[PDB]
Every structure is written in structure tokens, then in C-alpha cells.
Design a protein around this ligand. Structure first.
Ligand SMILES: [C][C]([C][C]/[C]=C(\[C])[C][C]/[C]=C(/[C])[C][C][C]=C([C])[C])[C][C]OP([O])(=O)OP([O])([O])=O[C]1O[C]([C][O])[C](O[C]2O[C]([C][O])[C]([O])[C]([O])[C]2[N]C([C])=O)[C]([O])[C]1[N]C([C])=O
Ligand SMILES: *[C@@H]1O[C@H](CO)[C@@H](O[C@@H]2O[C@H](CO)[C@@H](O)[C@H](O)[C@H]2NC(C)=O)[C@H](O)[C@H]1NC(C)=O
Lengths: 50, 701, 110, 149, 117, 37
């Protein structure tokens, strides 16, 4: 199994690892900018709490 | 926190010393592969001539060496060694040798020559860092030193035991450029004087000085066209030209070429132009503009006519020599192939292929444009020169493979600049390295990934750099570590078997022949025979006389009877030929037979020799039964294949087969009327025949 | 008229030149006269001996050019261009260059 | 003499000539020269000069036991020999790798849109990685023992 | 004369010169003097061709069109040079030289006739 | 005497280390505040 399959694992694992890194980078890049408007609403509630 | 408490000035200096120190160590060490694998011997054919000269100079003294006339070569014409050589390489070796003995360190002269080349490679590394630092910064300079140290292209001609002019020529060239750059940038006369002195040293070392004397005028001219000409340029260039011209002329070999040759005219023309330009500016400032036009037009008309007439007269009269054959070819590629057979014959004069470029340089080829782009983006007077140096080297390196060495220095420095720019730009992109001054607001929300982007970019660059080291190491170990004189073959069992036939034949001649004997061979082996055999030779590698070589070619290509007549006239005693059929050595005489045919027929006496005669009716060169009758009966064919028909080269092939041509000889049985077999090597690589005398009874032989 | 222009050019030059600069111009005229005279001799009497004629003629040009370089470095108008160079440093370099020139011409004079 | 030229123009309409410097003929810009150099670099590394002197075929031919003429693109086992097609293909890769860095550098400039910046980066890495990696394959075929020990 | 007739006349003169040059090409190249005679003919062909080209430009694009150094002047010179090569290489120097001498005076003539008016 | 195998490994090791150090030099050089002063 090792002599026939090992070349295939090399060809298949590299794309899989690149996809996994790309997915990590995409997830980190897709971090959504917290709406400053919702933050302003928190500030508005902060003045009610004070 | 121990490193942090040290001042930054300490940190930068400490790293600078460590990086440069290691680079010098690597440059020297990498060149020792040949000396370890094989014996400590001189490599190649040309270096032996230098070795013999170096010994004569050290033992005899400079004054005797200067006037040395050698009668043992180019018999019977002779050669004047003192006036036809470049003394730079020999003087350097002798001077170090005297110093070591002075301190009672007794080292062989042979060791000094063998190890001369690796030491200079380390010196070259230091010069590279300073020159790069001037153009851009220290960071680029450290990169350049690393690249230059292990570049395969430089290594090919600087390996241990390569006692050739190229080893020192590169170091002198870089030093001269470094002085020139400082001279222009500072504008100080003192730097200009240093630059001229370095130029003189290079002129003695190599014959390639011509390249520098044309590039420097070209750089100044471009600055004038672009409007960057300044007082600093005038002082630096003009001062160097006067001292450089006189210094170069001192060398006996150069003689009066600087002033009379068309090769050096370019420097003279630019020098005249600079005076005119400087004077015109001075007049314009003092004079009124309205008047200045009237004087300016009148002066130009009178001066221009006088200058044009003088220039035309000099070229037409022929007082200025036309370009030399060697240089004319470098420009016009076709000229050498069609007009001068001898120049075409050399195997290092062929055009370069893509594979050659990648094999020698690898990553640098990718990075070369990037360095060019940054230099164009930021134009500076010093930068302009480097662009001129690059773009010319590329053109002259394709034309001739040999000129690759000139290309290697410019390639390393420019590639380093590109790598430096990329590393600095992305690395400061990585905020973790430096918070420095930052504003969170207006931070470019078009950006999510600062940490990741820089990390990937730096990592990929590192991967390329490490690969470059591996490729350079493998190529040097496998390609440039082979001594020419000793051939390595693999036995049937796979053991490494060494063939020493080349030396063995020379030793046999040394002790077993009369001292006054004259040996005839192709010009390729002239240097080797003289150095080791210590016997007179008819032709030599320098090939100063074409007609003499052509006469030799006629004898070998002609029939047995005709060849004998020529040999008797020249008092030839022995003939040496190299045959590689038994061992599969490709570079035998038979492959080189064709060049002999063309050269022999080039002269008037060789008109009878026609190349087509040696081919089959179909245009083929074959040594089998179908070969041309003239070819089978020529002198060379008989010498190589005498008694060879009955030898079994291979078990799987019939007797008399030639392994390297993969063909069986057509003519197996023949006898030599005018030649007798004197000695043959164990593997038949070298065969020596003795010239028979006339007939005692006067019968026609 | 061109002749009128030359008269005014001399008139401005004499007033506007410091004595030290004028001394250089007088020295340069002497150097030029010697070099030109040698050149005329060569074309009238013949090239031979080429070694002597070339060595002597080159020496005149080297002296003339070296003087000009000093003439420009010391000038106040060009001080900005040759930044960092004091007059004393320029003179020391000029003597150093002259010494080399005399030595090299000396070898080839004979 | 001028009258002689007038003689044809007495019947013919003389052309109206304006001997002015052509507008397009300007001193080349610094970027313009760099572009011209880059294209030259492509040809020189390609071995165009080698092709002219040696005049090799675009592609050669080989054979096997099954016989028949395979075309050949790579000249096996001789470093200083090449075919026309092979030399140009290799040369293009070298130029592409250099450009990939320059485009990447331009991508880093500030004030670029989110979409533009991402797209430019992708092109830069693709050109650099493919150009370098492919070149190794080309040599490996030409010399079977390349980097093998 | 009328512009339409002028264009035809210039074309006819240029065409006749070119046909004659080819017909006697062997004789013209035989001797140096004859090759020089070819130089005069080639320049004349250039002058007539240039006149025809400007006349054609005026008719198609309207009267008063101005001939430029490129491509109108360059193209006419190139055509004359090509004919010179066919007879002999030597004329390309002489054939060219006569064309340039004619061109400078022709421009001088054109400036006086048109710019002054 | 050292064998060629030892020499080859030695060459590779020194080169790899040296290049990495040059990268490290670039790090400190940009990181240097006084360089920007
Ligand atoms: C090639 C080199 C050089 C480099 C340079 C360059 C690249 C530059 C170019 C130019 C220019 C001008 C550029 C610029 C541009 C513009 C302006 C546009 C060098 C080379 O080296 P060499 O030393 O030569 O080497 P070798 O080879 O080894 O040498 C030898 O050999 C030769 C051959 O090849 C020879 O030759 C001879 O010589 C003689 C003199 O004596 C004569 O006689 C003869 O004829 C000849 N032959 C032939 C075949 O050619 C030599 O000599 C030798 N050497 C010695 C030293 O001896
Ligand atoms: C190489 O051959 C020369 C040529 O003869 C040898 O020179 C002889 O040297 C011996 C020993 O010193 C003298 O007695 C002879 O008079 C020399 N002959 C000539 C013609 O000069 C030289 O010794 C040989 N080189 C060696 C042996 O290294």
C-alpha cells in the first residue's frame, strides 16, 4: 500500500492543506466590522445607566 | 533582556562583522572540493603556462623575467615571453611567496599558485559589500556578499588549482569600479587618483581591460545627454583619463595601442567633448544672452568644420588601426564564423543557451529585472552607471559563453538590491515588528490581514534563498571539481578508477628521449607538453602565428607521403596524437580533425585541401567501410587506428569497433611506411610515433 | 561686432577676478604654450622618437588639467557642489596627483 | 539651379512642406527605456543570438522500437545546445517571475479598494510561484541527474 | 494648373521615370558614371512622387492639406530608394544624396509660394 | 583529512545559517528607531 499510495497522498495532501490554510485566512478576513451604530446604541444605553 | 541593554550601535556593528566574517569563510572553503577529491594539481591547459612563468620569475628575478626570450616553443621562430604576456598574475604570486619564505615559512611554489585563487574570492566578497552599500544601503550589501560568494558562474574559473588570469581579473575590476563610484559621488581628486591606480593594476592582470575603458566613457556621455553633467563629473572623469592612459602604456604588451588603436578612441573622444562642454557653460554665464547667441553660432560653425575634417582625415589615412579581429567578432557575431576559422574553432566562443544561464545563476535570473526596476524608479548619478554595466553585460554574455564571468558580478549586486527592497517593504508592513507611530483612525479598512500578509511574503523569500544555496553547492561539486589532466572512469564493479595516461606519456618523453628532440602535436596541448615533458614543441595555445598552425594542419590531413615531406623540412622528431576510442573519451583529435582541415586550407599553400573531399558522396563524415577514400588514407586515421582493428573494445561488439563513434573502422589492416610505434599508453589514450629517417640505400619509401 | 564683445569680456574679467585666480590663469597660459610648441615640433621634424614625444606631450596635458581641477574646487561659486572639501584638502590632493604624473612620465620619457 | 526644380512646378502644384520636428518624437521617458530593456532581456536570455548563428531546427526527431518520428523540444544531455521553441519558452518564465514582484509591490500601496487589493495579490503570487517552479521542471527533463545525489 | 490635372501629371512623370530605370537597369549599373546618372533620375522620381502625393491628399481631404515629414515625405523617399537598390547598391548613396538636395530647395520654394501668400 | 561528503554538508549548513542571519539583520535595521531619527 505504501509504495503505490504514498505518491497519491503527496499529491492529495498538499491541495487539502492549502485549502485548509485558505479557509483559515478567509475566516479571519471575513471577521465582520462591528457596526459602530450598534456601539453608539450601547453608548446611548450607557448614558441611561448613568 | 541582555541583548536589549546593549546599545543599538553595538548591535548593528556586531551583526555586520559576523555576517561578513562568515561569508569570507564560505567563499574560500567552497573552492576546495577538487583539491580534496583529487590530488593538489594544476587544472586545465592554460594555467600550466602561468605556472612555468611564475617559477621562472621567482627564481630568476624580475629583471631577467622582463627580458626573457624562450627558444623552446614555436620552433624555429621562437617567442618573446617578456613582451607578449600579462605580468599581473605572476607578480602577485611571486610577491607573496617571497614574504612567506622571509618569515621562514617554507612553502612550495606549486602550493602558492594552487591556493592563490580561493583566497582572492574572499577578498572579492568584502569589496562587493562596500560597493553595494554606497549605491543603496548596508542591508543590500550584506545580501550581495552572500550571493557573490557561492555564485556558480564565478566558481567555475576560481576553483582551487585554477591558476588563470580570470581569478584576479574580477577582483581588480570591482575595486576599480568602487573607486570610480566614490570619485564621481564625492567629486574628490584623491578618490580619482586611487581609481586610476586600481585601473593600472587591472590592465597588467588581464587583457579584458578594454571593457572598462569603453564603459566609463559611455557612462559620462549618457549623463551629458540627460543633462546631469556637473563639475564633479568633469573632475572625476578627466583626471582619471590622463593618469590611466599613461599608466596602461607602461606595460610592454599594450605598447602604443591606447593612442593608435580604434579600440581606445572612444575614451579619447569623450575627453575632448568634456572640455568643449565645460568651456561653453562658462562663456554663457559671463556673457549677455543676446550677444551669446551670435558668438555661439559663429564659434560652432568654425570649430565644427575643423573637428570634422580632422576626424575624417585620421580614419581615411589609416593612422588609426582598425578594430582587432577578436573585438570585431564580439560585436558582429557572423564575422568570426565566416572570416576567421581559428576564432570559431575555440570551444568557449560559442553562443550561450538558456540552460547555461539558469545552471550558472538560477534564482538571480528571476531577480535581475527587479533590481533594474528600482534603479530606474530612483535615478541617481551613481545608479546610472550600474544600469549601463548591466545592460551591456547581458548582450556580450550571449555572444560568447566565456564572458559569463563578467556577467556574474553585476548579476549578484543587482539581484541583492531587488531582494533588499522587497524584504524591507513587507517587513515594516508587519506591525508586530514595529508599532512605531500609528493612527487607529483612518487605518485603511480595505485591510483585514496585516499579520498574515507579511509573514507569508517573508517566508516565501526565505524558501527561495535556501534553495539557491543547495543548487550552487550541487553544481560546484558535480561540475567544476574535475581536473582536466586526470580523468575519472567507473569500473565494472562500480569502483572509481583513475586514468593517468596524460601525465604518463609526458613522463615517458621526459626521461626516454633525446633532450633536443622536437615533438609535433595539435596546438591544444602545447602548454602541457612544455611544462611536464620539457621538450620542444612546434605549436602552442597562444596561436600568435596562424600560418605556422595551418602548415601543421596540412601535414596531418594529407596523405602519408606528402606529410613526410613537410615534417622533414621542420626537423620533426616525434608525433603525438590522442585517441579515445578504447575508453570513450570524447575530446580526441578525430573529432577535432575537421577544424584541422579548414585551418590547413585557409592559407595559400593549403588550397589543395578541400573539406568536401573528406565526406561521403552524401555529405557524411564516417570512418567505416563507407567512408571517403581520402579520409581512410589520411595520416591521422592511420595513426589513431594502427593495429586497432584486432582489439575487442566490447564483448557485445565485433573487433576493431570504435566505442566513442559507435562505428566499426572500415580499414583494419595497414602498415606505416614512414612512421614507427614508439610508445602507447595502457588505455591507448596517448600514442607516440617516431619519424623514420631517410633510406640508407636511397630507395623511394 | 565680435571684436567689441571680446573687449568687454576682458574688461569684466579683469575687474571680477581675485588675484589668486588670476595667478592660475597666467600659469595655465604658460603650460598651454609649452604643450603647443612641442606639438608643432613633432609634426615638422617627424614622429621619431615616438617614446620621447609622447611622454613629454602627455606631461604638459596632465599639468594643465590638474591645475584646472584646483581652479574649480577652490572657487567659492562652486563650494556647494564640492561639499565637505576645504581648500587645504584640495591642494594636498593636487600635489599628490602631480607627484604620480611626474613619476610615470619619467619611466616612458626614455 | 533652383529654377530647374521650378520647371516641373510651373505646371504642377508644389507640395506644401512644413519641416518641423515631429510631435511624437520626444526623448524617451525613464519608464519607457525600462520597458524597452525588459523586452530585450527576454530575447537575449531566450538564446535568439544562439539561434541565428547555429540555426537549429524548431524541433528535432527521435525514434524507438515502435519506431516513428517523435518531435523533440528539449536537447537532452548537452547544456550548450537548444531548440528554437525551448529557448523562448524558458526565457518567458524568467521575465514573468520578475514582474510578479513588481505588481505585488504596487498592490501594497495605500488607498486601494478591498476587491482590487485582493485580486492584485492573487496574480502576483501565481506568476512568481509558477514561473520559479516550472523552470526547475524544465531543467530536470533536460538533465536527468539534476540535483540528484 | 488645376489640382486634379496636376495630380495626374505628377503621377505620369514619376511612373515614366521608374519604368525607364528598370528597363535600362543593366546598362546603368555597368559604369560608375551611368550609376551617377541613375542618381539624378531617382531624385527626379522622388520629387514628382512627392508632388503627386500632396495633390492626392488635397483632393481627398480638401485643399490646403499640409505634408508632414512623416509619413508623407518619408514614404516618398523610401519608394525612390527602393528603385535605386534594384539597379545597383551604389546608387543608394548617390540616389539619396540628390533627393535630399532637391528637397531643401523644394521646401524653400514652397515656403515662398504659400507662406508669403 | 576530511572526506568530500563532510565538506559538502559543511558548505550547505554555513550558507543556510548565513542567509537567515542577513534576514535577521533586516529585522533589526527597520526596527531601529534611531535609523528613523
Ligand atoms: C574577449 C576579452 C575582452 C573583454 C572585453 C569586452 C567584452 C569589451 C568589448 C568591447 C567594447 C568596445 C565594448 C564597448 C562598446 C561600444 C563602444 C559600442 C579578452 C580575451 O582574453 P584573451 O587574453 O585574448 O584570452 P586567450 O584566448 O586565452 O588569449 C589567447 O588567445 C587569443 C585567441 O583567442 C590570442 O589571440 C591572438 O593574439 C595575438 C596577439 O599576440 C594575435 O597576433 C593573434 O592573431 C590572435 N589570434 C586569434 C585567433 O585571435 C591571444 O593573444 C592570447 N592571449 C595572450 C595573452 O597571448
Ligand atoms: C629541462 O630541459 C632543459 C634543457 O636542457 C634542462 O636544462 C639543462 O639543465 C642541466 C642541469 O642543470 C644543465 O646541465 C644543462 O646545460 C641544461 N641544458 C640547457 C640546454 O639549458 C633542464 O635541466 C630540464 N629541466 C629539469 C630537469 O627540470
Amino acid at each position: 500500500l505504501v509504495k503505490g499510495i504514498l505518491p497519491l497522498v503527496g499529491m492529495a495532501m498538499v491541495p487539502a492543506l492549502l485549502g485548509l490554510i485558505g479557509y483559515h485566512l478567509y475566516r479571519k478576513a471575513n471577521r465582520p466590522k462591528v457596526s459602530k451604530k450598534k456601539l453608539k446604541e450601547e453608548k446611548r444605553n450607557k448614558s441611561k445607566k448613568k | 533582556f541582555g541583548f536589549l541593554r546593549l546599545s543599538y550601535e553595538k548591535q548593528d556593528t556586531l551583526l555586520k562583522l559576523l555576517i561578513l566574517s562568515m561569508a569570507a569563510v564560505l567563499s574560500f572553503s567552497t573552492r576546495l572540493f577538487a583539491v580534496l577529491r583529487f590530488e593538489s594539481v594544476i587544472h586545465e591547459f592554460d594555467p600550466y603556462f602561468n605556472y612555468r612563468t611564475t617559477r621562472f620569475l621567482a627564481e630568476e628575478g624580475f629583471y631577467k623575467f622582463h627580458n626573457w626570450f624562450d627558444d623552446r616553443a614555436w620552433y624555429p621562430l621562437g617567442r618573446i615571453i617578456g613582451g607578449t604576456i600579462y605580468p599581473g598574475l605572476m607578480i602577485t604570486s611571486a610577491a607573496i611567496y617571497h614574504v612567506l619564505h622571509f618569515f621562514h615559512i617554507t612553502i612550495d611554489i606549486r602550493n602558492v599558485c594552487v591556493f592563490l585563487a580561493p583566497l582572492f574570492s574572499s577578498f572579492t566578497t568584502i569589496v562587493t559589500y562596500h560597493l553595494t552599500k554606497e549605491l543603496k544601503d548596508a542591508g543590500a550589501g550584506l545580501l550581495a556578499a552572500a550571493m557573490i560568494a557561492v555564485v556558480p558562474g564565478y566558481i567555475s574559473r576560481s576553483v582551487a588549482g585554477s591558476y588563470d588570469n580570470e581569478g584576479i581579473a574580477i577582483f581588480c575590476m570591482l575595486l576599480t569600479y568602487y573607486m570610480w563610484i566614490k570619485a564621481v559621488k564625492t567629486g574628490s581628486i584623491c578618490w580619482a587618483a586611487k581609481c586610476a591606480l586600481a585601473y593600472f593594476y587591472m590592465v597588467s592582470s588581464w587583457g579584458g581591460y578594454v571593457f572598462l575603458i569603453n564603459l566609463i566613457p559611455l557612462h559620462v556621455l549618457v549623463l551629458m545627454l540627460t543633462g546631469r553633467f556637473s563639475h564633479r563629473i568633469y573632475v572625476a572623469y578627466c583626471t582619471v583619463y590622463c593618469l590611466g592612459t599613461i599608466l596602461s602604456m607602461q606595460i610592454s604588451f599594450v605598447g602604443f595601442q591606447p593612442v593608435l588603436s580604434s579600440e581606445h578612441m572612444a575614451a579619447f573622444g569623450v575627453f575632448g567633448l568634456c572640455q568643449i562642454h565645460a568651456f561653453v557653460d562658462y562663456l554663457r554665464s559671463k556673457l549677455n544672452p543676446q550677444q551669446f547667441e551670435v558668438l555661439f553660432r559663429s564659434v560652432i560653425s568654425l570649430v565644427g568644420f575643423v573637428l570634422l575634417t580632422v576626424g575624417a582625415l585620421l580614419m581615411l589615412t589609416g593612422k588609426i588601426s582598425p578594430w582587432t579581429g577578436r573585438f570585431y567578432s564580439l560585436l558582429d557575431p557572423s564575422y568570426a564564423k565566416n572570416n576567421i576559422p581559428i576564432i570559431a574553432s575555440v570551444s568557449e566562443h560559442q553562443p550561450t543557451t538558456w540552460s547555461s544561464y539558469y545552471f550558472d545563476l538560477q534564482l538571480l535570473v528571476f531577480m535581475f529585472p527587479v533590481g533594474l526596476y528600482y534603479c530606474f524608479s530612483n535615478l541617481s548619478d551613481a545608479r546610472i552607471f550600474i544600469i549601463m554595466y548591466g545592460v551591456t553585460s547581458m548582450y556580450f554574455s550571449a555572444v560568447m559563453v566565456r564572458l559569463m564571468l563578467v556577467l556574474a558580478p553585476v548579476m549578484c549586486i543587482l539581484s541583492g538590491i531587488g531582494v533588499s527592497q522587497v524584504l524591507s517593504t513587507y517587513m515594516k508592513n508587519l506591525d508586530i515588528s514595529r508599532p512605531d507611530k500609528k493612527s487607529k483612525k483612518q487605518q485603511d479598512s480595505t485591510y483585514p490581514i496585516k499579520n498574515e500578509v507579511a509573514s507569508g511574503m517573508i517566508l516565501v523569500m526565505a524558501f527561495f534563498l535556501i534553495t539557491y544555496t543547495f543548487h550552487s553547492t550541487w553544481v560546484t561539486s558535480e561540475a567544476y571539481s574535475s581536473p582536466s589532466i586526470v580523468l575519472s572512469a567507473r569500473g565494472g564493479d562500480g569502483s572509481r578508477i583513475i586514468f593517468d595516461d596524460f601525465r604518463e606519456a609526458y613522463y615517458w618523453l621526459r626521461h626516454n628521449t633525446p633532450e633536443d628532440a622536437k615533438v609535433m602535436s595539435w596546438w591544444d596541448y602545447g602548454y602541457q607538453i612544455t611544462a611536464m615533458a620539457n621538450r620542444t614543441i612546434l605549436v602552442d595555445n597562444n596561436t600568435w602565428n596562424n600560418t605556422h598552425i595551418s602548415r601543421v594542419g596540412q601535414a596531418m590531413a594529407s596523405t602519408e607521403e606528402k606529410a613526410y615531406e613537410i615534417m622533414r623540412e621542420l626537423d620533426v622528431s616525434y608525433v603525438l596524437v590522442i585517441f579515445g576510442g578504447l575508453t570513450g573519451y570524447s575530446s580526441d583529435d578525430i573529432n577535432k580533425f575537421l577544424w584541422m582541415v579548414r585551418i590547413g586550407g585557409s592559407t595559400d599553400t593549403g588550397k589543395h585541401i578541400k573539406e568536401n573531399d573528406y565526406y561521403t558522396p552524401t555529405g557524411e563524415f564516417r570512418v567505416d567501410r563507407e567512408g571517403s577514400p581520402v579520409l581512410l588514407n589520411c595520416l591521422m586515421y592511420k595513426m589513431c587506428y594502427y593495429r586497432f582493428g584486432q582489439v575487442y573494445t566490447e564483448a557485445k561488439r565485433p573487433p576493431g569497433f570504435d566505442r566513442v563513434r559507435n562505428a566499426e573502422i572500415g580499414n583494419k589492416d595497414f602498415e606505416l611506411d614512414v612512421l614507427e610505434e614508439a610508445y602507447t599508453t595502457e588505455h591507448w589514450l596517448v600514442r607516440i610515433y617516431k619519424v623514420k629517417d631517410l633510406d640508407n640505400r636511397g630507395l623511394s619509401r | 561686432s565680435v571684436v567689441s564683445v571680446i573687449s568687454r569680456f576682458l574688461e569684466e574679467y579683469l575687474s571680477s577676478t581675485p588675484q589668486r585666480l588670476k595667478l592660475l590663469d597666467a600659469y595655465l597660459l604658460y603650460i598651454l604654450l609649452t604643450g603647443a610648441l612641442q606639438f608643432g615640433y613633432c609634426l615638422l621634424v617627424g614622429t621619431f622618437p615616438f617614446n620621447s614625444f609622447l611622454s613629454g606631450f602627455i606631461s604638459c596635458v596632465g599639468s594643465f588639467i590638474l591645475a584646472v581641477c584646483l581652479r574649480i574646487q577652490i572657487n567659492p561659486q562652486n563650494k556647494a557642489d564640492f561639499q565637505g572639501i576645504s581648500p587645504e584638502r584640495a591642494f594636498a590632493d593636487f600635489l599628490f596627483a602631480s607627484t604620480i604624473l611626474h613619476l610615470v612620465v619619467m619611466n616612458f620619457v626614455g | 539651379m533652383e529654377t530647374l526644380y521650378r520647371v516641373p512646378f510651373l505646371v504642377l502644384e508644389c507640395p506644401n512642406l512644413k519641416l518641423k520636428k515631429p510631435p511624437w518624437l520626444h526623448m524617451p521617458s525613464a519608464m519607457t527605456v525600462y520597458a524597452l530593456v525588459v523586452v530585450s532581456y527576454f530575447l537575449i536570455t531566450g538564446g535568439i543570438i544562439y539561434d541565428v548563428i547555429v540555426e537549429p531546427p524548431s524541433v528535432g526527431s527521435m525514434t524507438d522500437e515502435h519506431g516513428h518520428q517523435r518531435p523533440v523540444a528539449f536537447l537532452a544531455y548537452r547544456v550548450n545546445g537548444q531548440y528554437i521553441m525551448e529557448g523562448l519558452a524558458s526565457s518567458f518564465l524568467f521575465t514573468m517571475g520578475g514582474l510578479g514582484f513588481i505588481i505585488l509591490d504596487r498592490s501594497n500601496a495605500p488607498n486601494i479598494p478591498k476587491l482590487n487589493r485582493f485580486l492584485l495579490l492573487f496574480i502576483g503570487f501565481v506568476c512568481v510561484l509558477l514561473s520559479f517552479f516550472m523552470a526547475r521542471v524544465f531543467m530536470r527533463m533536460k538533465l536527468p541527474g539534476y540535483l540528484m545525489g | 494648373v488645376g489640382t486634379g490635372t496636376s495630380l495626374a501629371l505628377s503621377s505620369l512623370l514619376s511612373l515614366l521615370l521608374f519604368a525607364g530605370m528598370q528597363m535600362y537597369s543593366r546598362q546603368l549599373a555597368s559604369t560608375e558614371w551611368l550609376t551617377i546618372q541613375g542618381g539624378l533620375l531617382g531624385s527626379g522620381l522622388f520629387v514628382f512622387s512627392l508632388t503627386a502625393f500632396n495633390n492626392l491628399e488635397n483632393l481627398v481631404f480638401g485643399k490646403g492639406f499640409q505634408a508632414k515629414i512623416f509619413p508623407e515625405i518619408l514614404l516618398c523617399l523610401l519608394l525612390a530608394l527602393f528603385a535605386s537598390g534594384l539597379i545597383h547598391r551604389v546608387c543608394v548613396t548617390t540616389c539619396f544624396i540628390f533627393s535630399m538636395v532637391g528637397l531643401y530647395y523644394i521646401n524653400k520654394i514652397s515656403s515662398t509660394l504659400y507662406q508669403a501668400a | 583529512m576530511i572526506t568530500d561528503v563532510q565538506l559538502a554538508i559543511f558548505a550547505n549548513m554555513l550558507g543556510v545559517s548565513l542567509f537567515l542571519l542577513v534576514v535577521l539583520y533586516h529585522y533589526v535595521a527597520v526596527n531601529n528607531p534611531k535609523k528613523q531619527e
